[PDB]
Design a protein around this ligand. Structure first.
Ligand SMILES: OC[C@H]1O[C@H](O[C@@H]2[C@H](O)[C@@H](O)O[C@H](CO)[C@H]2O)[C@@H](O)[C@@H](O)[C@@H]1O
Ligand SMILES: OC[C@H]1O[C@H](O[C@@H]2[C@H](O)[C@@H](O)O[C@H](CO)[C@H]2O)[C@@H](O)[C@@H](O)[C@@H]1O
Ligand code: MAN
Ligand code: MAN
Ligand code: MAN
Ligand code: MAN
Ligand code: ZN
Ligand code: ZN
Ligand code: ZN
Lengths: 140, 138
C-alpha cells in the first residue's frame, strides 16, 4: 500500500514470510553458524510491540539493538548452496552509527544493498531449516 | 526519497538525474565494459534525455511500453585496466528482462524490486560508467 520492497535474495526453498513494515524496529537478532539459520525481529506496530521468528532455530544469536535515532541503512550478505539448499550463508547490516556482521561462515554469491537515502522498515523472505531468502521494506 | 546504491567504483564525476515521472527509455552503451547510459524520461510535463558515462560501446535500447516499469537492476563491477567500473549491466521490467550488457565479470550485485519501481538514476561516470544507483518509487 505504497510499500517498497527490495529482494528477496536467496533461494526458493522454505515457506514465504513477510512481517510488513513497522513504526520502529527495536532489535534484530541474527541466528547463525555455518550459515544464516534465522532472524528474530522485535518491533512496534500500531502501539503493540511484537517479535516475529523467521527461518529455523539453530545457530548462535547475534543481537542488534537499535538506539534512539539509529536506523538500519544497509544490508549485505552472500547466498549459496549449503549441502543441497540455496540459503543465505552470510548476512550483515549497517546502521547510521555502526556496522554489524557479517554473520555466517558459508561463502557464495554476494549481494549488497547500500541505502544512500532511506532506511529499512521491515522484512520478508523465505525460511525453512535456515534463512533461504531475505528481503527488506524501505521508507524515507 | 529512496536512493539505493551506488554499485561500482569511486572514479569519475558524480551524476544525479533525480526521480522522474516516467522512464521512457534506457539506452545502454557497452563493449567489454558498460560505457554509458542514455535515460529518456518525463519531468513536470517536459521530456528530457541525460547521458551518463562516455561515448564508447554499442547501444541497446530498453523502450518502455504502456504500464511497463523497471522492477530490477543487476550487474557486475570490477577493475578494468585501472578503474573500478560496471562491467556488466542489466534490467528487468514487469514484462521481460534485458541483457545483461558488457563482457567483463566482477563482483555481482542484484536489485530485485518485489514492490515499487525504478524512477531515476544516480552514480559516477567518466569515459565508462564507474557506478550506478537508483531512485525507488512505490
Ligand atoms: O548454521 C548451520 C548450523 O551450523 C553448525 O552445525 C553443523 C550442521 O548443523 C550440520 O552439518 O551438522 C554438523 C556436524 O557437526 C554441524 O557442525 C552449528 O553452528 C549449528 O548451530 C547451526 O544450526
Ligand atoms: O570512467 C572511468 C575513468 O575515466 C577516466 O580515467 C582515465 C582513463 O581510465 C584512461 O584514459 O587512463 C587514465 C589514466 O590512467 C584515467 O585517468 C577518468 O574520468 C576517471 O576518473 C574515471 O574513473
Ligand atoms: O563472529 C561471529 C560468529 O559467531 C559464531 O562463531 C557463529 O555464530 C558465526 O556464525 C558468527 O560469524
Ligand atoms: O531452510 C532450508 C530448507 O529447510 C528445509 O530442509 C526445507 O524447508 C527446505 O524447503 C528449505 O529449503
Ligand atoms: O567497453 C569498452 C570498449 O570495449 C570495446 O573495445 C569497444 O566496444 C569500445 O567501444 C568500448 O569503449
Ligand atoms: O554481452 C552483452 C553485450 O555486450 C556488448 O556490449 C555487445 O557486443 C552486445 O552486442 C552484447 O550483447
Ligand atoms: Zn526466534
Ligand atoms: Zn556437502
Ligand atoms: Zn548519449
Amino acid at each position: 500500500n505504497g510499500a517498497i520492497k527490495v529482494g528477496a535474495w536467496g533461494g526458493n526453498g522454505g515457506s514465504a514470510f513477510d512481517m510488513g513494515p513497522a513504526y520502529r524496529i527495536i532489535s534484530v537478532k541474527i541466528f547463525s553458524g555455518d550459515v544464516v539459520d534465522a532472524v528474530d525481529v522485535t518491533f512496534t506496530y500500531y502501539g503493540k510491540t511484537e517479535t516475529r521468528h523467521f527461518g529455523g532455530s539453530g545457530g548462535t544469536p547475534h543481537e542488534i539493538v537499535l538506539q534512539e535515532g539509529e536506523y538500519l541503512v544497509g544490508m549485505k550478505g552472500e547466498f549459496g548452496n549449503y549441502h543441497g539448499v540455496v540459503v543465505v550463508g552470510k548476512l550483515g547490516f549497517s546502521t547510521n552509527k555502526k556496522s554489524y556482521g557479517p554473520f555466517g561462515n558459508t561463502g557464495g554469491t554476494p549481494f549488497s544493498l547500500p541505502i544512500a537515502a532511506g532506511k529499512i522498515s521491515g522484512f520478508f523472505g523465505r525460511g525453512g531449516d535456515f534463512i533461504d531468502a531475505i528481503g527488506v521494506y524501505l521508507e524515507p
